[PDB]
Amino acid sequence: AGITGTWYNQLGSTFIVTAGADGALTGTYESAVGNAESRYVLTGRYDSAPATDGSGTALGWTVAWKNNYRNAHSATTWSGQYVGGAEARINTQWLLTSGTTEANAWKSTLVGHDTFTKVKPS
Amino acid sequence: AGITGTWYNQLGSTFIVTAGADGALTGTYESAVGNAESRYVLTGRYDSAPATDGSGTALGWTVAWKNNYRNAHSATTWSGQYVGGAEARINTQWLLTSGTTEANAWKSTLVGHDTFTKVKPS
Amino acid sequence: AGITGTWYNQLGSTFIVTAGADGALTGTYESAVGNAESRYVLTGRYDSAPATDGSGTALGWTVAWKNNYRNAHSATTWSGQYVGGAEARINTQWLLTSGTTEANAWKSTLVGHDTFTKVKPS
Amino acid sequence: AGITGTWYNQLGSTFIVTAGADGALTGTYESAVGNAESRYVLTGRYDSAPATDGSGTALGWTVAWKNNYRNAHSATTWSGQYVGGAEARINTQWLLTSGTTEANAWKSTLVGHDTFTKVKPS
């Protein structure tokens, strides 16, 4: 429970994630709101025995932007924490790297944040 | 091939990973050499068909810092690219997130970089 | 209008800043609203001829967390952009490096994000 | 106390910087080994009473990529620590932001690292 299920960020993006008993996160990422080729494999890990003091649950997952149809030659990883209950939400920061020449290494990695909630937004 | 194998970073951390045809990354991590008290589960994704024009192969992976010995209440994700050849390496940046309370949420995430080689460092 | 003035983020921090003619940012950052021993010097840079296509105004500044009464032995740099208009704001990502040692250098840099508006939260 | 002076990274970029006794950092950056058009104002802050326990000296500075010649509608912030001695060096992580539209704001900011030494490498 808790992590398992559908999450939406505040810009029309989805991922259905199942959380395993050991600490696994596997699922998909529907980069577009719906369509079977904006969909990408997702896998990750989470603190499957988190503090009880009212801290968040630490987690991260990875998606590589290749599927059956498309390749961005790149990948994103999210790192953050899960908060349950009233405003259940996943707070993250993310890195998105592209394969580059050595020459372009330096401009290879974008950084950002993102918040997913259990209820779609506007 | 290439990616599958054992990897070392400047600080003597190690990880043994398997790269699957799909795009799966599966192995373990160790943040303190010698001992298996720092053996944690790694799962990830990589670009199973990258752009042969000389660019790196994009990938990322996650490690939840909980195993059967200790629990850290935090996870790390690595974003980066793999390069093979005589100087084979994985160059990454990473986010380390600790579960916190609303209060310390601003102190939740560590950022860094990491270069992994097939050869143990001095 | 523009950048020059008073800004607020969600957590009760303010800075007052003057946007110099040729590209300077100078001012003070108060981490606690109405608290004297929490003012620190701010210095920065911004794009003084930003585009005319809707884009934001690139900017960044720095605070070394040392003043008259306190010294954290650390520093933050904010990088982001300014948007004027009805919903004026400065969207930022920040890095916070503390002085560490060789050994502990890995755990030296906090990463995050922040948004300042001309009009207080609640 | 030896922050002021000339600094190099491996991609043949320099900055010259003067560190006042008030926490100020003023200087020039020059992404080209030589070349007036490649010069940009630099301004920052550092910790002017750093601990003497073997920790680096925390600092950061900003550069807005507009000068008397060019405008890149962006700015970099570097955050990091000065390490003196004979292996003297400034270890940083940086954030590069361009002015984007709200639409492209997600790919606004690059991340990376950089090391500077008082001596040009390879």
PDB file of all heavy atoms in Angstrom, chain A residues 43 45 47 49 55-56 58 62 66 71 73 77-81 95 97 99-100 102, chain B residues 41 43 47-49 51 55-56 60 71 73-74 77-79 81 89 95 97 100:
ATOM      1  N   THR A  43      11.721   1.395 -12.981  1.00  0.00           N
ATOM      2  CA  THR A  43      12.143   0.523 -11.892  1.00  0.00           C
ATOM      3  C   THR A  43      12.894   1.308 -10.833  1.00  0.00           C
ATOM      4  O   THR A  43      13.589   2.268 -11.152  1.00  0.00           O
ATOM      5  CB  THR A  43      13.022  -0.619 -12.400  1.00  0.00           C
ATOM      6  OG1 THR A  43      13.044  -1.657 -11.420  1.00  0.00           O
ATOM      7  CG2 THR A  43      14.425  -0.128 -12.691  1.00  0.00           C
ATOM      8  N   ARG A  45      13.685   1.686  -6.115  1.00  0.00           N
ATOM      9  CA  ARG A  45      13.840   1.143  -4.771  1.00  0.00           C
ATOM     10  C   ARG A  45      13.294   2.156  -3.770  1.00  0.00           C
ATOM     11  O   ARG A  45      13.256   3.361  -4.051  1.00  0.00           O
ATOM     12  CB  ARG A  45      15.311   0.832  -4.467  1.00  0.00           C
ATOM     13  CG  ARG A  45      16.026   0.003  -5.549  1.00  0.00           C
ATOM     14  CD  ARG A  45      15.697  -1.477  -5.475  1.00  0.00           C
ATOM     15  NE  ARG A  45      15.890  -1.980  -4.122  1.00  0.00           N
ATOM     16  CZ  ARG A  45      15.445  -3.148  -3.679  1.00  0.00           C
ATOM     17  NH1 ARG A  45      14.795  -3.959  -4.494  1.00  0.00           N
ATOM     18  NH2 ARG A  45      15.662  -3.496  -2.418  1.00  0.00           N
ATOM     19  N   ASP A  47      12.732   2.890   0.808  1.00  0.00           N
ATOM     20  CA  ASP A  47      12.977   2.482   2.183  1.00  0.00           C
ATOM     21  C   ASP A  47      11.780   1.679   2.698  1.00  0.00           C
ATOM     22  O   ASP A  47      10.785   2.236   3.151  1.00  0.00           O
ATOM     23  CB  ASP A  47      13.239   3.707   3.061  1.00  0.00           C
ATOM     24  CG  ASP A  47      13.512   3.338   4.506  1.00  0.00           C
ATOM     25  OD1 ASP A  47      13.366   2.144   4.848  1.00  0.00           O
ATOM     26  OD2 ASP A  47      13.861   4.238   5.299  1.00  0.00           O
ATOM     27  N   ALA A  49      11.164   0.073   5.230  1.00  0.00           N
ATOM     28  CA  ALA A  49      10.953   0.039   6.676  1.00  0.00           C
ATOM     29  C   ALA A  49      11.304   1.393   7.250  1.00  0.00           C
ATOM     30  O   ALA A  49      12.247   1.518   8.031  1.00  0.00           O
ATOM     31  CB  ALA A  49      11.789  -1.046   7.325  1.00  0.00           C
ATOM     32  N   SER A  55       8.641  11.173   9.418  1.00  0.00           N
ATOM     33  CA  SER A  55       9.507  11.428   8.276  1.00  0.00           C
ATOM     34  C   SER A  55       8.858  10.868   7.031  1.00  0.00           C
ATOM     35  O   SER A  55       7.896  10.101   7.116  1.00  0.00           O
ATOM     36  CB  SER A  55      10.884  10.794   8.463  1.00  0.00           C
ATOM     37  OG  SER A  55      11.406  11.086   9.743  1.00  0.00           O
ATOM     38  N   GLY A  56       9.399  11.245   5.879  1.00  0.00           N
ATOM     39  CA  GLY A  56       8.972  10.690   4.610  1.00  0.00           C
ATOM     40  C   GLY A  56       9.656   9.367   4.321  1.00  0.00           C
ATOM     41  O   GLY A  56      10.563   8.945   5.034  1.00  0.00           O
ATOM     42  N   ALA A  58      11.955   7.314   1.824  1.00  0.00           N
ATOM     43  CA  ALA A  58      12.936   7.600   0.786  1.00  0.00           C
ATOM     44  C   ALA A  58      12.830   6.591  -0.353  1.00  0.00           C
ATOM     45  O   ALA A  58      12.617   5.399  -0.130  1.00  0.00           O
ATOM     46  CB  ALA A  58      14.314   7.609   1.364  1.00  0.00           C
ATOM     47  N   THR A  62      14.113   4.990 -11.972  1.00  0.00           N
ATOM     48  CA  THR A  62      14.853   5.318 -13.159  1.00  0.00           C
ATOM     49  C   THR A  62      13.969   4.998 -14.327  1.00  0.00           C
ATOM     50  O   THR A  62      13.220   4.024 -14.276  1.00  0.00           O
ATOM     51  CB  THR A  62      16.173   4.499 -13.253  1.00  0.00           C
ATOM     52  OG1 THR A  62      17.001   4.784 -12.122  1.00  0.00           O
ATOM     53  CG2 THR A  62      16.920   4.831 -14.506  1.00  0.00           C
ATOM     54  N   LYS A  66      13.885   4.948 -23.966  1.00  0.00           N
ATOM     55  CA  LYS A  66      13.707   4.074 -25.105  1.00  0.00           C
ATOM     56  C   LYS A  66      12.516   3.190 -24.791  1.00  0.00           C
ATOM     57  O   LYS A  66      12.346   2.792 -23.639  1.00  0.00           O
ATOM     58  CB  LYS A  66      14.959   3.236 -25.366  1.00  0.00           C
ATOM     59  CG  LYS A  66      14.743   2.144 -26.380  1.00  0.00           C
ATOM     60  CD  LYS A  66      15.986   1.294 -26.566  1.00  0.00           C
ATOM     61  CE  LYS A  66      15.888   0.451 -27.832  1.00  0.00           C
ATOM     62  NZ  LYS A  66      14.651  -0.382 -27.894  1.00  0.00           N
ATOM     63  N   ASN A  71      13.441   6.357 -29.073  1.00  0.00           N
ATOM     64  CA  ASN A  71      14.673   6.489 -28.307  1.00  0.00           C
ATOM     65  C   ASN A  71      15.132   7.943 -28.218  1.00  0.00           C
ATOM     66  O   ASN A  71      15.410   8.585 -29.232  1.00  0.00           O
ATOM     67  CB  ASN A  71      15.783   5.626 -28.923  1.00  0.00           C
ATOM     68  CG  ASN A  71      16.660   4.970 -27.872  1.00  0.00           C
ATOM     69  OD1 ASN A  71      16.818   5.493 -26.760  1.00  0.00           O
ATOM     70  ND2 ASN A  71      17.232   3.812 -28.215  1.00  0.00           N
ATOM     71  N   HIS A  73      17.785   8.516 -26.600  1.00  0.00           N
ATOM     72  CA  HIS A  73      19.127   8.289 -26.103  1.00  0.00           C
ATOM     73  C   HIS A  73      19.326   9.068 -24.820  1.00  0.00           C
ATOM     74  O   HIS A  73      20.222   9.909 -24.734  1.00  0.00           O
ATOM     75  CB  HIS A  73      20.160   8.703 -27.133  1.00  0.00           C
ATOM     76  CG  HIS A  73      20.055   7.948 -28.418  1.00  0.00           C
ATOM     77  ND1 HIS A  73      19.927   6.575 -28.464  1.00  0.00           N
ATOM     78  CD2 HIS A  73      20.059   8.370 -29.702  1.00  0.00           C
ATOM     79  CE1 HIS A  73      19.855   6.184 -29.723  1.00  0.00           C
ATOM     80  NE2 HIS A  73      19.936   7.254 -30.494  1.00  0.00           N
ATOM     81  N   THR A  77      16.554   9.916 -13.604  1.00  0.00           N
ATOM     82  CA  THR A  77      16.352   9.304 -12.308  1.00  0.00           C
ATOM     83  C   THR A  77      15.792  10.326 -11.328  1.00  0.00           C
ATOM     84  O   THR A  77      16.218  11.483 -11.296  1.00  0.00           O
ATOM     85  CB  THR A  77      17.638   8.719 -11.739  1.00  0.00           C
ATOM     86  OG1 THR A  77      18.468   9.773 -11.250  1.00  0.00           O
ATOM     87  CG2 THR A  77      18.370   7.969 -12.811  1.00  0.00           C
ATOM     88  N   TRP A  78      14.836   9.872 -10.528  1.00  0.00           N
ATOM     89  CA  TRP A  78      14.182  10.685  -9.524  1.00  0.00           C
ATOM     90  C   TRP A  78      14.644  10.279  -8.139  1.00  0.00           C
ATOM     91  O   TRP A  78      14.782   9.099  -7.854  1.00  0.00           O
ATOM     92  CB  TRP A  78      12.664  10.526  -9.614  1.00  0.00           C
ATOM     93  CG  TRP A  78      12.003  11.115 -10.830  1.00  0.00           C
ATOM     94  CD1 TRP A  78      11.331  12.302 -10.897  1.00  0.00           C
ATOM     95  CD2 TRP A  78      11.908  10.527 -12.134  1.00  0.00           C
ATOM     96  NE1 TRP A  78      10.839  12.494 -12.162  1.00  0.00           N
ATOM     97  CE2 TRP A  78      11.167  11.419 -12.940  1.00  0.00           C
ATOM     98  CE3 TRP A  78      12.367   9.330 -12.698  1.00  0.00           C
ATOM     99  CZ2 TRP A  78      10.882  11.159 -14.280  1.00  0.00           C
ATOM    100  CZ3 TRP A  78      12.082   9.071 -14.046  1.00  0.00           C
ATOM    101  CH2 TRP A  78      11.350   9.984 -14.817  1.00  0.00           C
ATOM    102  N   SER A  79      14.856  11.247  -7.262  1.00  0.00           N
ATOM    103  CA  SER A  79      15.187  10.939  -5.882  1.00  0.00           C
ATOM    104  C   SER A  79      14.353  11.844  -4.965  1.00  0.00           C
ATOM    105  O   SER A  79      14.232  13.050  -5.180  1.00  0.00           O
ATOM    106  CB  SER A  79      16.689  11.105  -5.645  1.00  0.00           C
ATOM    107  OG  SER A  79      17.062  10.735  -4.332  1.00  0.00           O
ATOM    108  N   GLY A  80      13.737  11.256  -3.959  1.00  0.00           N
ATOM    109  CA  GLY A  80      12.855  12.035  -3.124  1.00  0.00           C
ATOM    110  C   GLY A  80      12.288  11.216  -1.993  1.00  0.00           C
ATOM    111  O   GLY A  80      12.889  10.222  -1.565  1.00  0.00           O
ATOM    112  N   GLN A  81      11.125  11.637  -1.504  1.00  0.00           N
ATOM    113  CA  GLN A  81      10.479  10.922  -0.422  1.00  0.00           C
ATOM    114  C   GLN A  81       8.984  10.925  -0.582  1.00  0.00           C
ATOM    115  O   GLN A  81       8.402  11.839  -1.170  1.00  0.00           O
ATOM    116  CB  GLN A  81      10.855  11.517   0.926  1.00  0.00           C
ATOM    117  CG  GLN A  81      10.930  13.007   0.935  1.00  0.00           C
ATOM    118  CD  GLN A  81      11.276  13.526   2.298  1.00  0.00           C
ATOM    119  OE1 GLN A  81      10.874  12.949   3.310  1.00  0.00           O
ATOM    120  NE2 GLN A  81      12.035  14.614   2.341  1.00  0.00           N
ATOM    121  N   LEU A  95      17.433  14.111 -12.190  1.00  0.00           N
ATOM    122  CA  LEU A  95      18.498  14.299 -13.162  1.00  0.00           C
ATOM    123  C   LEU A  95      18.138  13.597 -14.455  1.00  0.00           C
ATOM    124  O   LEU A  95      17.669  12.464 -14.452  1.00  0.00           O
ATOM    125  CB  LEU A  95      19.812  13.761 -12.620  1.00  0.00           C
ATOM    126  CG  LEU A  95      20.303  14.475 -11.373  1.00  0.00           C
ATOM    127  CD1 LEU A  95      21.303  13.622 -10.648  1.00  0.00           C
ATOM    128  CD2 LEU A  95      20.885  15.822 -11.751  1.00  0.00           C
ATOM    129  N   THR A  97      19.929  12.654 -18.075  1.00  0.00           N
ATOM    130  CA  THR A  97      21.207  12.690 -18.773  1.00  0.00           C
ATOM    131  C   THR A  97      21.012  12.219 -20.197  1.00  0.00           C
ATOM    132  O   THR A  97      20.191  11.352 -20.461  1.00  0.00           O
ATOM    133  CB  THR A  97      22.267  11.818 -18.068  1.00  0.00           C
ATOM    134  OG1 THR A  97      22.338  12.159 -16.675  1.00  0.00           O
ATOM    135  CG2 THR A  97      23.624  12.011 -18.696  1.00  0.00           C
ATOM    136  N   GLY A  99      23.200  10.703 -23.620  1.00  0.00           N
ATOM    137  CA  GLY A  99      24.460  10.280 -24.180  1.00  0.00           C
ATOM    138  C   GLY A  99      24.997  11.429 -25.013  1.00  0.00           C
ATOM    139  O   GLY A  99      24.260  12.036 -25.794  1.00  0.00           O
ATOM    140  N   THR A 100      26.274  11.751 -24.822  1.00  0.00           N
ATOM    141  CA  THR A 100      26.935  12.841 -25.544  1.00  0.00           C
ATOM    142  C   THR A 100      28.375  12.474 -25.913  1.00  0.00           C
ATOM    143  O   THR A 100      28.947  11.523 -25.362  1.00  0.00           O
ATOM    144  CB  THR A 100      26.992  14.164 -24.713  1.00  0.00           C
ATOM    145  OG1 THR A 100      28.090  14.110 -23.786  1.00  0.00           O
ATOM    146  CG2 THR A 100      25.683  14.437 -23.967  1.00  0.00           C
ATOM    147  N   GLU A 102      32.468  13.361 -25.803  1.00  0.00           N
ATOM    148  CA  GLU A 102      33.258  13.849 -24.692  1.00  0.00           C
ATOM    149  C   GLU A 102      33.168  15.357 -24.703  1.00  0.00           C
ATOM    150  O   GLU A 102      33.020  15.993 -23.665  1.00  0.00           O
ATOM    151  CB  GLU A 102      34.707  13.391 -24.797  1.00  0.00           C
ATOM    152  CG  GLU A 102      34.868  11.882 -24.718  1.00  0.00           C
ATOM    153  CD  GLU A 102      36.300  11.436 -24.947  1.00  0.00           C
ATOM    154  OE1 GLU A 102      36.899  11.851 -25.968  1.00  0.00           O
ATOM    155  OE2 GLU A 102      36.828  10.673 -24.104  1.00  0.00           O
TER     156      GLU A 102
ATOM    157  N   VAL B  41      20.864  -3.614  -2.765  1.00  0.00           N
ATOM    158  CA  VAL B  41      20.272  -3.945  -4.056  1.00  0.00           C
ATOM    159  C   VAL B  41      20.286  -2.754  -4.996  1.00  0.00           C
ATOM    160  O   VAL B  41      19.893  -1.649  -4.621  1.00  0.00           O
ATOM    161  CB  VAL B  41      18.817  -4.451  -3.913  1.00  0.00           C
ATOM    162  CG1 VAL B  41      18.092  -4.392  -5.256  1.00  0.00           C
ATOM    163  CG2 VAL B  41      18.789  -5.869  -3.333  1.00  0.00           C
ATOM    164  N   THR B  43      18.855  -1.554  -8.752  1.00  0.00           N
ATOM    165  CA  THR B  43      18.136  -1.751  -9.999  1.00  0.00           C
ATOM    166  C   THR B  43      18.183  -0.487 -10.843  1.00  0.00           C
ATOM    167  O   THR B  43      18.174   0.614 -10.302  1.00  0.00           O
ATOM    168  CB  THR B  43      16.666  -2.149  -9.758  1.00  0.00           C
ATOM    169  OG1 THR B  43      16.097  -2.615 -10.993  1.00  0.00           O
ATOM    170  CG2 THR B  43      15.860  -0.974  -9.215  1.00  0.00           C
ATOM    171  N   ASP B  47      20.118   2.714 -22.027  1.00  0.00           N
ATOM    172  CA  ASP B  47      19.680   2.793 -23.407  1.00  0.00           C
ATOM    173  C   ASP B  47      20.196   1.569 -24.147  1.00  0.00           C
ATOM    174  O   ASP B  47      21.356   1.520 -24.542  1.00  0.00           O
ATOM    175  CB  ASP B  47      20.167   4.099 -24.047  1.00  0.00           C
ATOM    176  CG  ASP B  47      19.710   4.249 -25.476  1.00  0.00           C
ATOM    177  OD1 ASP B  47      19.161   3.287 -26.027  1.00  0.00           O
ATOM    178  OD2 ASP B  47      19.919   5.322 -26.070  1.00  0.00           O
ATOM    179  N   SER B  48      19.327   0.577 -24.328  1.00  0.00           N
ATOM    180  CA  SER B  48      19.711  -0.695 -24.929  1.00  0.00           C
ATOM    181  C   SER B  48      20.089  -0.601 -26.417  1.00  0.00           C
ATOM    182  O   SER B  48      20.570  -1.578 -27.002  1.00  0.00           O
ATOM    183  CB  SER B  48      18.588  -1.715 -24.741  1.00  0.00           C
ATOM    184  OG  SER B  48      17.466  -1.405 -25.545  1.00  0.00           O
ATOM    185  N   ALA B  49      19.901   0.567 -27.023  1.00  0.00           N
ATOM    186  CA  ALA B  49      20.283   0.791 -28.423  1.00  0.00           C
ATOM    187  C   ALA B  49      20.785   2.211 -28.639  1.00  0.00           C
ATOM    188  O   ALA B  49      20.127   3.016 -29.279  1.00  0.00           O
ATOM    189  CB  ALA B  49      19.114   0.510 -29.339  1.00  0.00           C
ATOM    190  N   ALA B  51      23.139   5.695 -29.580  1.00  0.00           N
ATOM    191  CA  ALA B  51      23.477   6.315 -30.844  1.00  0.00           C
ATOM    192  C   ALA B  51      24.950   6.131 -31.157  1.00  0.00           C
ATOM    193  O   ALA B  51      25.807   6.758 -30.537  1.00  0.00           O
ATOM    194  CB  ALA B  51      23.119   7.777 -30.811  1.00  0.00           C
ATOM    195  N   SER B  55      28.655   8.848 -28.977  1.00  0.00           N
ATOM    196  CA  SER B  55      28.139   9.365 -27.710  1.00  0.00           C
ATOM    197  C   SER B  55      28.184   8.287 -26.646  1.00  0.00           C
ATOM    198  O   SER B  55      28.359   7.108 -26.944  1.00  0.00           O
ATOM    199  CB  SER B  55      26.701   9.880 -27.855  1.00  0.00           C
ATOM    200  OG  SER B  55      26.464  10.434 -29.139  1.00  0.00           O
ATOM    201  N   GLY B  56      28.010   8.700 -25.402  1.00  0.00           N
ATOM    202  CA  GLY B  56      27.872   7.752 -24.324  1.00  0.00           C
ATOM    203  C   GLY B  56      26.527   7.063 -24.403  1.00  0.00           C
ATOM    204  O   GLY B  56      25.655   7.466 -25.156  1.00  0.00           O
ATOM    205  N   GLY B  60      20.664   5.198 -15.735  1.00  0.00           N
ATOM    206  CA  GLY B  60      20.642   5.579 -14.332  1.00  0.00           C
ATOM    207  C   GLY B  60      20.232   4.400 -13.491  1.00  0.00           C
ATOM    208  O   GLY B  60      19.679   3.444 -14.025  1.00  0.00           O
ATOM    209  N   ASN B  71      19.499   0.225   8.234  1.00  0.00           N
ATOM    210  CA  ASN B  71      18.583   1.013   7.428  1.00  0.00           C
ATOM    211  C   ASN B  71      18.962   2.458   7.571  1.00  0.00           C
ATOM    212  O   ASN B  71      19.114   2.954   8.685  1.00  0.00           O
ATOM    213  CB  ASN B  71      17.130   0.802   7.857  1.00  0.00           C
ATOM    214  CG  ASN B  71      16.140   1.382   6.865  1.00  0.00           C
ATOM    215  OD1 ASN B  71      16.476   2.257   6.064  1.00  0.00           O
ATOM    216  ND2 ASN B  71      14.909   0.894   6.912  1.00  0.00           N
ATOM    217  N   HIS B  73      17.270   5.063   5.756  1.00  0.00           N
ATOM    218  CA  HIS B  73      16.143   5.967   5.515  1.00  0.00           C
ATOM    219  C   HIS B  73      16.514   6.991   4.477  1.00  0.00           C
ATOM    220  O   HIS B  73      16.346   8.194   4.682  1.00  0.00           O
ATOM    221  CB  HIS B  73      15.725   6.658   6.797  1.00  0.00           C
ATOM    222  CG  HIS B  73      15.303   5.702   7.857  1.00  0.00           C
ATOM    223  ND1 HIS B  73      14.682   4.508   7.564  1.00  0.00           N
ATOM    224  CD2 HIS B  73      15.442   5.739   9.202  1.00  0.00           C
ATOM    225  CE1 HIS B  73      14.442   3.855   8.684  1.00  0.00           C
ATOM    226  NE2 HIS B  73      14.896   4.579   9.693  1.00  0.00           N
ATOM    227  N   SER B  74      17.030   6.496   3.361  1.00  0.00           N
ATOM    228  CA  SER B  74      17.490   7.346   2.287  1.00  0.00           C
ATOM    229  C   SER B  74      17.775   6.475   1.067  1.00  0.00           C
ATOM    230  O   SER B  74      18.035   5.285   1.190  1.00  0.00           O
ATOM    231  CB  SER B  74      18.727   8.145   2.715  1.00  0.00           C
ATOM    232  OG  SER B  74      19.799   7.284   3.044  1.00  0.00           O
ATOM    233  N   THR B  77      20.027   7.984  -6.354  1.00  0.00           N
ATOM    234  CA  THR B  77      19.889   7.704  -7.762  1.00  0.00           C
ATOM    235  C   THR B  77      21.074   8.312  -8.526  1.00  0.00           C
ATOM    236  O   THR B  77      21.560   9.405  -8.222  1.00  0.00           O
ATOM    237  CB  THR B  77      18.564   8.242  -8.322  1.00  0.00           C
ATOM    238  OG1 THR B  77      18.592   9.673  -8.358  1.00  0.00           O
ATOM    239  CG2 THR B  77      17.409   7.776  -7.464  1.00  0.00           C
ATOM    240  N   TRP B  78      21.538   7.569  -9.512  1.00  0.00           N
ATOM    241  CA  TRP B  78      22.644   7.973 -10.340  1.00  0.00           C
ATOM    242  C   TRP B  78      22.140   8.226 -11.744  1.00  0.00           C
ATOM    243  O   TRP B  78      21.478   7.376 -12.340  1.00  0.00           O
ATOM    244  CB  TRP B  78      23.721   6.882 -10.368  1.00  0.00           C
ATOM    245  CG  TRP B  78      24.568   6.785  -9.149  1.00  0.00           C
ATOM    246  CD1 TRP B  78      25.794   7.382  -8.946  1.00  0.00           C
ATOM    247  CD2 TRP B  78      24.295   6.026  -7.966  1.00  0.00           C
ATOM    248  NE1 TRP B  78      26.286   7.049  -7.704  1.00  0.00           N
ATOM    249  CE2 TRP B  78      25.393   6.210  -7.085  1.00  0.00           C
ATOM    250  CE3 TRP B  78      23.238   5.210  -7.560  1.00  0.00           C
ATOM    251  CZ2 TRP B  78      25.454   5.601  -5.823  1.00  0.00           C
ATOM    252  CZ3 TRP B  78      23.298   4.613  -6.297  1.00  0.00           C
ATOM    253  CH2 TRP B  78      24.399   4.810  -5.450  1.00  0.00           C
ATOM    254  N   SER B  79      22.477   9.384 -12.283  1.00  0.00           N
ATOM    255  CA  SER B  79      22.230   9.660 -13.687  1.00  0.00           C
ATOM    256  C   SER B  79      23.566   9.828 -14.423  1.00  0.00           C
ATOM    257  O   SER B  79      24.482  10.491 -13.932  1.00  0.00           O
ATOM    258  CB  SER B  79      21.371  10.910 -13.834  1.00  0.00           C
ATOM    259  OG  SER B  79      20.435  10.770 -14.886  1.00  0.00           O
ATOM    260  N   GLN B  81      26.247   8.318 -18.048  1.00  0.00           N
ATOM    261  CA  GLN B  81      26.464   7.605 -19.295  1.00  0.00           C
ATOM    262  C   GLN B  81      27.662   6.700 -19.188  1.00  0.00           C
ATOM    263  O   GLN B  81      28.595   6.958 -18.427  1.00  0.00           O
ATOM    264  CB  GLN B  81      26.642   8.575 -20.467  1.00  0.00           C
ATOM    265  CG  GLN B  81      27.369   9.861 -20.130  1.00  0.00           C
ATOM    266  CD  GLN B  81      27.360  10.834 -21.288  1.00  0.00           C
ATOM    267  OE1 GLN B  81      27.121  10.451 -22.435  1.00  0.00           O
ATOM    268  NE2 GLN B  81      27.632  12.103 -20.995  1.00  0.00           N
ATOM    269  N   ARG B  89      34.351   3.641 -18.710  1.00  0.00           N
ATOM    270  CA  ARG B  89      33.987   4.382 -17.512  1.00  0.00           C
ATOM    271  C   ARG B  89      32.491   4.657 -17.466  1.00  0.00           C
ATOM    272  O   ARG B  89      31.814   4.674 -18.500  1.00  0.00           O
ATOM    273  CB  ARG B  89      34.751   5.698 -17.469  1.00  0.00           C
ATOM    274  CG  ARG B  89      34.524   6.514 -18.716  1.00  0.00           C
ATOM    275  CD  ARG B  89      35.375   7.763 -18.772  1.00  0.00           C
ATOM    276  NE  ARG B  89      34.936   8.633 -19.859  1.00  0.00           N
ATOM    277  CZ  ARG B  89      35.460   8.625 -21.080  1.00  0.00           C
ATOM    278  NH1 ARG B  89      36.459   7.798 -21.372  1.00  0.00           N
ATOM    279  NH2 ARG B  89      34.990   9.449 -22.005  1.00  0.00           N
ATOM    280  N   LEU B  95      21.846  12.026  -6.780  1.00  0.00           N
ATOM    281  CA  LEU B  95      21.050  12.615  -5.720  1.00  0.00           C
ATOM    282  C   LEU B  95      20.831  11.599  -4.595  1.00  0.00           C
ATOM    283  O   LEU B  95      20.369  10.479  -4.824  1.00  0.00           O
ATOM    284  CB  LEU B  95      19.709  13.104  -6.274  1.00  0.00           C
ATOM    285  CG  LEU B  95      19.823  14.139  -7.394  1.00  0.00           C
ATOM    286  CD1 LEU B  95      18.493  14.389  -8.081  1.00  0.00           C
ATOM    287  CD2 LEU B  95      20.384  15.425  -6.839  1.00  0.00           C
ATOM    288  N   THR B  97      18.661  11.138  -1.245  1.00  0.00           N
ATOM    289  CA  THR B  97      17.551  11.732  -0.491  1.00  0.00           C
ATOM    290  C   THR B  97      17.293  11.006   0.820  1.00  0.00           C
ATOM    291  O   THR B  97      17.159   9.789   0.856  1.00  0.00           O
ATOM    292  CB  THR B  97      16.216  11.760  -1.295  1.00  0.00           C
ATOM    293  OG1 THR B  97      16.421  12.394  -2.564  1.00  0.00           O
ATOM    294  CG2 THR B  97      15.130  12.534  -0.508  1.00  0.00           C
ATOM    295  N   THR B 100      12.572  12.876   5.613  1.00  0.00           N
ATOM    296  CA  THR B 100      12.587  13.917   6.635  1.00  0.00           C
ATOM    297  C   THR B 100      11.156  14.223   7.055  1.00  0.00           C
ATOM    298  O   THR B 100      10.216  13.616   6.548  1.00  0.00           O
ATOM    299  CB  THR B 100      13.287  15.237   6.138  1.00  0.00           C
ATOM    300  OG1 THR B 100      12.400  15.986   5.299  1.00  0.00           O
ATOM    301  CG2 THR B 100      14.560  14.938   5.363  1.00  0.00           C
TER     302      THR B 100
END
